[PDB]
Design a protein around this ligand. Sequence first.
Ligand code: GDP
Lengths: 280, 322
Amino acid sequence: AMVLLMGVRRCGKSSICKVVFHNSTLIDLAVMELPGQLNYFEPSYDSERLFKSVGALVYVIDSQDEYINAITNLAMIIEYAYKVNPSINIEVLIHKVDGLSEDFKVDAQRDIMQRTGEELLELGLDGVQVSFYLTSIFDHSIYEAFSRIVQKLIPELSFLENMLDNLIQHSKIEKAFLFDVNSKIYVSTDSNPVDIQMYEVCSEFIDVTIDLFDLYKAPELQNVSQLANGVIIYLRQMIRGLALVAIIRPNGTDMESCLTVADYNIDIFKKGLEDIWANA
Amino acid sequence: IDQVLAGYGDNLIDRKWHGFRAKYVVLPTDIPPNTYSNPEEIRVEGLRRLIGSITRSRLRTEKEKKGRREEIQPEVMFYTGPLYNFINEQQTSLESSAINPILMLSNSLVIDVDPAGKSSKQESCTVHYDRVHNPDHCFHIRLEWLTTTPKLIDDLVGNWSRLCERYGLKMIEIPWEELCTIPSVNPFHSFVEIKLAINPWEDPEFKDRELFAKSKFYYHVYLLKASGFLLDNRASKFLQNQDIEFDIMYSWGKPQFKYVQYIHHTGAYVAELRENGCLFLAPNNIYISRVAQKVILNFKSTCLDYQKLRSIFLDAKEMWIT
Ligand SMILES: Nc1nc2c(ncn2[C@@H]2O[C@H](COP(=O)(O)OP(=O)(O)O)[C@@H](O)[C@H]2O)c(=O)[nH]1
């Protein structure tokens, strides 16, 4: 599942790649950037294998600059992308939206959606669904957008959801995330809504873990961080680059008993995750 | 009101009251980059696509809603020069699909403004679209409604504007009433009368009886052309000099226009050419509110400065001689 990043020059593709993937199917592979300038597309210039090898195409639109020509170029790209392979999920990121109001952001997304739909109606493409995400480097939005894009390319999503829901229901876990060690792109969660504050807490917990471990090296990552109110944050490395970070509440119970039952349950969950080849 | 709101609007009597009305003008402005799919025939396809989208949005009954090729769109016919020259041209003893004793310059149909079932009511406006078009004459689309939601019509206008802007053109909105009546309706509106510096009917440097027999307002029309305006009243009687086979009547009513009206190609200002050579100048407040004051003041300066108006009139005389 290799995703292809496409956009106009100076839209921010390299900056997104540097921020996310630098700080197979599921691991954060070396993605392919593609600088696409306005021109006439050559008909079938040995690009069929390239677009057949892309699991999901991602388009980047700069909200600061004018973007009607960008939408026209995007529709031109989709016009052969959907023709070559009818199974590609198509993603559009409205990047550089840090300095915009909420009403302006919603109106801009609605205008972009309407323009893309009208252009696809003019080009005669039907049965295509293009997703849109308001992304920016300076906040959590790009991480969540890549999380949704990656989640669309894991066929075992509902089974991981059931496994995490069962783990949470039997360990008094407030919220459990299945992060990856790089790029902080959470792969699976429960049916509970992904709170932004809790996501940032877990991501900066990942950062603290990795930095502290890297400070003392050259002699399986496990972490218990307990707060004042008894709420604990737990880290256990899963298979390959995956790791599990769970916010667990004590609910007025013994700290060590809760830690022991959580450790046993999470070890059981990792043993179950060993059977399914969700890693890498 | 209750009679026409119940479906009894076929009384065919000229009512003294009017419903909500909106008049939209298509103006050729600029070709977008790429979209090659000539800059003078892509706008023809743009108007054809706009008319096709309008006629495709026809309100239909449930029996025709459940069923599944519709008739082709009516043709828009193009010409050069004043409209009366084209009217005195159909005499040709050939064909019958050419502007065919009152002449309906437009045709009307009921539309289905909310197709998605967004509104709980039934939405139905009425569109009037012309049957003629020139690159030098602006295009008219009219929306008449009585009880529709004034947001679904706004996004319908937005869809039309986007469909235009994929091609060239630029859809603008202008007040339905004349420019000369805005002090008699809206006293706060900006409205300036212009007595231009050089009178071409009596100046020794610019005077000819043959020219005034040919084109009386030739200097004024060239002044409006060189300052970036398009004729709004294409069916008036102040510019052309020919006859007619009885009066021409639009699909919405008789044209009650005192003077010829002009729209700036940007869509921001409206001018009006009087009989005595004076002009009326005002801004389009609907375009400004929906979406810029130095252009109208610069035009006022050019119409009030002797040197610049002299230069434009000299260019007009030079083009007339050569
Ligand atoms: N404020 C802001 N600027 C951004 C963002 N993303 C990219 N940029 C700007 O984009 C520039 C980098 O663009 P770059 O990645 O080199 O474009 P590319 O090479 O075509 O992919 C930087 O100078 C940033 O200022 C963002 O989310 N917020």
